[PDB]
Ligand binder design. Structure first.
Ligand code: HEM
Length: 154
């Protein structure tokens, strides 16, 4: 699949809103992920004891993890599908070290869309939601290919 320039511009326009406060957005996204899919928290060896939203919010270390993830995602989205350099090390760490199934990337894609819908309806209307779905789907498909190259199904 490919995104049009129109679609990339919708994706990057709403992404600029995230950058007003990446840490706050990442906190919402991670908490959404963990509460919607408690099994995902088990993958974070440093944080798997933080089993409620109140505990999650009170860890600056967890919020720094959120910043790291969203900063990397922002850089990937700005490659507009020419993102192969950014994905090889990311796939290697998530396939082989963190052991993240592709389905968990579908979960965090869901959480990202949910948080953007909650916080930025003025720039996350119907067209922008479709474009972001496609951009994150492309990210997951390209990661899944790199998983396969490393011998992991995902
Ligand atoms: C948009 C999707 C994601 C992006 C861009 C992303 C990015 C990153 C980056 C850049 C790092 C630090 C370098 C590395 O270890 O590769 C990291 C660490 C990590 N990621 Fe991801 N990630 C994503 C999704 C996920 C998901 C869904 C999970 C688990 C359900 C996960 C689990 C982890 C863990 C456990 C670490 C190590 C955290 C720590 O330092 O304690 N990642 N991620």
């Amino acid at each position: 699949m490919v995104l049009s320039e129109y679609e990339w511009q919708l994706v990057l326009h709403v992404w600029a809103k995230v950058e007003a406060d990446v840490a706050g957005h990442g906190q919402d996204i991670l908490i959404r992920l963990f509460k919607s899919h408690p099994e995902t928290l088990e993958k974070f060896d440093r944080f798997k004891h933080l089993k409620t939203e109140a505990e999650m919010k009170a860890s600056e270390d967890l919020k720094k993890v959120g910043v790291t993830a969203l900063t990397a995602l922002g850089a990937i989205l700005k490659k507009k599908g020419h993102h192969e350099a950014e994905l090889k090390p990311l796939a290697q760490s998530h396939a082989t070290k963190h052991k993240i199934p592709i389905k968990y990337l579908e979960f965090i894609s869901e959480a990202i869309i949910h948080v953007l819908h909650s916080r930025h309806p003025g720039n996350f209307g119907a067209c922008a939601q479709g474009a972001m779905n496609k951009a994150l789907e492309l990210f997951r498909k390209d990661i899944a290919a790199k998983y396969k190259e490393l011998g992991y199904q995902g």
